[PDB]
Structure of DprE1:
Amino acid sequence: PTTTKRLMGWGRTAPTVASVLSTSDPEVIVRAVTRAAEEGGRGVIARGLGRSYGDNAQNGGGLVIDMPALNRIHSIDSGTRLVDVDAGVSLDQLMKAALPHGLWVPVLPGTRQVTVGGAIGCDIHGKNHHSAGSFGNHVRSMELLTANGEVRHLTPAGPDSDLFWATVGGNGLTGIILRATIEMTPTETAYFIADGDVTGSLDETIAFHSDGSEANYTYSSAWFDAISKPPKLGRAAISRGSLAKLDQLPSKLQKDPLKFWYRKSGTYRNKVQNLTQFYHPGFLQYQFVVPTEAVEEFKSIIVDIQRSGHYSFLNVFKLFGPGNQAPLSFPIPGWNVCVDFPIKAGLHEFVTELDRRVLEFGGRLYTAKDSRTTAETFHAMYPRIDEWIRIRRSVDPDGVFASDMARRLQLL
Ligand SMILES: Cc1cc2nc3c(=O)[nH]c(=O)nc-3n(C[C@H](O)[C@H](O)[C@H](O)COP(=O)(O)OP(=O)(O)OC[C@H]3O[C@@H](n4cnc5c(N)ncnc54)[C@H](O)[C@@H]3O)c2cc1C
Ligand SMILES: *N(O)c1cc(C(F)(F)F)cc2c(=O)nc(N3CCC4(CC3)OC[C@H](C)O4)sc12
């Protein structure tokens, strides 16, 4: 039942207070939206598990629908590879449910604690982006509650393709997704055949990813060094691989294939690994991508980070593949970097500086990772933003759907 609560992003900054609804009944959500439309307060926004670091899933003064309560899985079909799920279904929940059927979650982020609705809302990406694209590429259909109380059937190629692609990466600003059909990835096992490599510099890391080699693997990411001075800066521990076939597993693991003095270094070949072993090996979360061809410019950001004295120990490096049709979708082909800055004096001035260099080089920031950037910067980082706003207003003219991010980045 609707009640006032303090809500925060994962980064635990900029708290605001809102009214919160938690229901497993789609009809209560419809009535709440229609009621909010007829009364027109500060607005409605859907919330998933709250794994975004910023302010996209909160609406100070308004209403927030806690979506995790709406978590029924309707059907799993190995033949079509299709899965019909409530937007509040967890990726962890869906994984556990679809694995015995031989189906794999097509895009897996760093944590399995995200809703389908939040996966779509931020168009999440994973280690397999260069081969699979982002989460939006794998949504066959979705049911979207709009400001007028209508539930719209949306498809990537069909009649409402425009609303579909404005919803993907739309950060809940086109309405509340109630339900989706996801096309899962077929798999024989829950294991990876993996290669490990180590490089000695930023240049080597770049070159390693630049020789067409990435096409040999479905999944690829790397940790890199952001603390050492050149020539050691950028040296990386690269982890690449693909889902194993059954005949590639040792016999001891073939029993249960879909189950949930040596020198130890980062170089190995054709290693069989489970999900934990392949993935796993306050703080300002910062993520940016610059275009592939902007190699020297990308290098300059990494160098400047190191020179700045802001020291990040947890950094992820990935080469993104082609993007998709969503105007607000974060990934573009090019160099993606996640960095974790300990909060210190001068950090905020520095990230402001980083934002503008990313802007100049043709790059963008991720909505799931931001709480600080300015509206003029963000608009400029997404060339299709005005096209998106026009679509958003067509389905929500009176601004029934709103969030702290939407007011901050002027997305209404
Ligand atoms: C440890 C960690 C690792 C991560 N790794 C990755 C990664 O590798 N790749 C990556 O892309 N992201 C990553 N993320 C970010 C995360 O995947 C996204 O922020 C995701 O959107 C969070 O899902 P959520 O269910 O918590 O949604 P929330 O954070 O609650 O909300 C996200 C947005 O989606 C909207 N939304 C949520 N549910 C609905 C719905 N039912 N209908 C309409 N709109 C909705 C909200 O309005 C909000 O704008 C990571 C986060 C953490 C904490
Ligand atoms: N950046 O946040 C990031 C990018 C990618 C990639 F897909 F672009 F390559 C992948 C990625 C990832 O796989 N895991 C991340 N984690 C964040 C920190 C971590 C591990 C997972 O450490 C503990 C905490 C619970 O999560 S970030 C990431």
In short: Residues 10, 45-52, 56-57, 67, 87, 109-111, 114-115, 117-118, 121-122, 124-126, 171-172, 176-177, 368 surround flavin-adenine dinucleotide (ligand 1) (CB under 6 Å). The chain is about 25% helix and 25% strand. The first helix runs from residue 26 to 39.
